C-alpha cells in the first residue's frame, strides 16, 4: 500500500492564526489527495479533494496545495470551530490509504501541573492487587514526563497513563499515571514516589509517601 505521512502529529494555535499542516506520500500520487476534518464522536467531513478543490459547504478559509509526494492544508484565520483532527488520504490507487492525523489544539499560557500521589486504600490491599495513582492536574502544554520511583529506583513497566481532552473552561490537560502491583510486590518496598517534569517547572517535582505511614 501507499504510505501516507502527516506532520506534525499535533499543533497549538489561536483563533485568527494561519496554520499549515503537511502530508507526504511514499510514492507519487499526482494530485489525488483529499483532506478530512474529524471532531470527537462526530462524522468526518470532506474539506478538500484533488489536492486543492474545496468541497461543497466548506468555508473558503480552507485551502490545499501540492503535487507528487508533498502536500499541505492551510487554514487562514483559524476559527473556534476549526479545532479538530485533520486527516489526509491518497486515492491514486487501491486501497485508498489515510495519514495518522494532525490534531489542532487551542494554544494558551504555560501552566505547571499540580501533582498529587495517592496510596492504595486498605480495602485495595486486602484484594491482593493494588494501584498507586499519580495525578497531574490542569497543566499546559500536553507534553509531560511522569516517572515512578520505588525506594529511589526507577520502576518501569506496570504503569499506564490516561489524559483528558483539553478542558472546555481553561484549555488545560489533566493526566493520571497508575502503577499496578501485586500486594506481595507492593509490601516489599517502603517509599513510593512519582517524579514529574514539565515545561512549566524549572526542576522536576516529586510527590511521595511511605507505605503504611
Amino acid at each position: 500500500d501507499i504510505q501516507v505521512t502527516q506532520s506534525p502529529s499535533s499543533l497549538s494555535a489561536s483563533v485568527g492564526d494561519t496554520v499549515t499542516i503537511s502530508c507526504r506520500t511514499s510514492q507519487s500520487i499526482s494530485t489525488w489527495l483529499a483532506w478530512y476534518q474529524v471532531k470527537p464522536g462526530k462524522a468526518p467531513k470532506l474539506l478538500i479533494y484533488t489536492a486543492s478543490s474545496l468541497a461543497s459547504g466548506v468555508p473558503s478559509r480552507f485551502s490545499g496545495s501540492g503535487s507528487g509526494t508533498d502536500f499541505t492544508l492551510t487554514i487562514s484565520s483559524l476559527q473556534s470551530e476549526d479545532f479538530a483532527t485533520y486527516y489526509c488520504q491518497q486515492y491514486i490507487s487501491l486501497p485508498p490509504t489515510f495519514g495518522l492525523g494532525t490534531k489542532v489544539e487551542i494554544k494558551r499560557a504555560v501552566a505547571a501541573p499540580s501533582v498529587f500521589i495517592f496510596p492504595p486504600s486498605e480495602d485495595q490491599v486486602k484484594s491482593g492487587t493494588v494501584s498507586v495513582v499519580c495525578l497531574l492536574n490542569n497543566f499546559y502544554p500536553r507534553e509531560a514526563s511522569v516517572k515512578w520511583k520505588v525506594d529511589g529506583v526507577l520502576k518501569t513497566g506496570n504503569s499506564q497513563e490516561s489524559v483528558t481532552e483539553q478542558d472546555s473552561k481553561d484549555n488545560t490537560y489533566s493526566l493520571s499515571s497508575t502503577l499496578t502491583l501485586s500486594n506481595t510486590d507492593y509490601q516489599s518496598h517502603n517509599v513510593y514516589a512519582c517524579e514529574v517534569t514539565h515545561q512549566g517547572l524549572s526542576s522536576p517535582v516529586t510527590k511521595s509517601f511511605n507505605r503504611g505511614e
Binding site: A34, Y49, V163
Partner: protein, 219 residues
Amino acid sequence: QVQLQESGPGLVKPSETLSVTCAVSGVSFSSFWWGWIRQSPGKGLEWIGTIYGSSGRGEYNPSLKSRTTISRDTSKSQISLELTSVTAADTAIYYCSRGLFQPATLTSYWFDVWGPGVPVTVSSASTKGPSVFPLAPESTAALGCLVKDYFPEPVTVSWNSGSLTSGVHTFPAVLQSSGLYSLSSVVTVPSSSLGTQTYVCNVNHKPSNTKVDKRVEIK
C-alpha cells in the same frame, strides 16, 4: 441532502461474525457507491470496501477481503458489512461512506459523505461490575475514586450526587491485560474543607445494574 446512519451489535465475541448496517436516505440509493471505513483505537483509518448501489459489484481492501462481505438491502435502502472470524483487533468505530471516483484510467475512492460511526467492541469478557476504591491524600487537595475491573464500558461517575461538578475530571477508561476496564475520577477541593466536609463518589455501571457510593476521606 444525503444522510447516513450506522447501526450494529455493540459487542461481538471473538471468532463470531461482526455485522453492521447503514441506512442511506435523502438520495437515490442505486445512483452512487457506498462503502465502509473503520478506525481502531490508537490506529489510523482503514478503508474496508465500496460497492455500487446499482449492481452490488465493488472493490475491497486486500487486507480484509477474505473476511468481508458488503451487500445491499434495496427494500430498506441499506448496505451491510459482514466481517467474519473477528478478534480483539477488529474493535473499532465503523463508518458508512459514499465513495466517489473520477476520470484521471480512474482514480480510487475519496469519501464525500460519512456517517457518525458505530463503535463495536470484540471481546470474550463477561459482564462484570466495578470495584470502587477511594483515592485520598497546600491550599488545594485532590480526592478521587478508582473504578476498576469492569466490563463492558461505560461507567458514569458523579460527586455528591451531582452537587459537585467544578474541578471534576473523569479520565478515559483503559483496557487492562485482564480484558477488564479501569478509570479514575478526581476532584480538587480546599484543604481546609477536609475533615469538616464529606466527599462521596457515586458510580453507576448500568450493564451490571450496580451503583456504588464511596465516601472519600483522609486515613
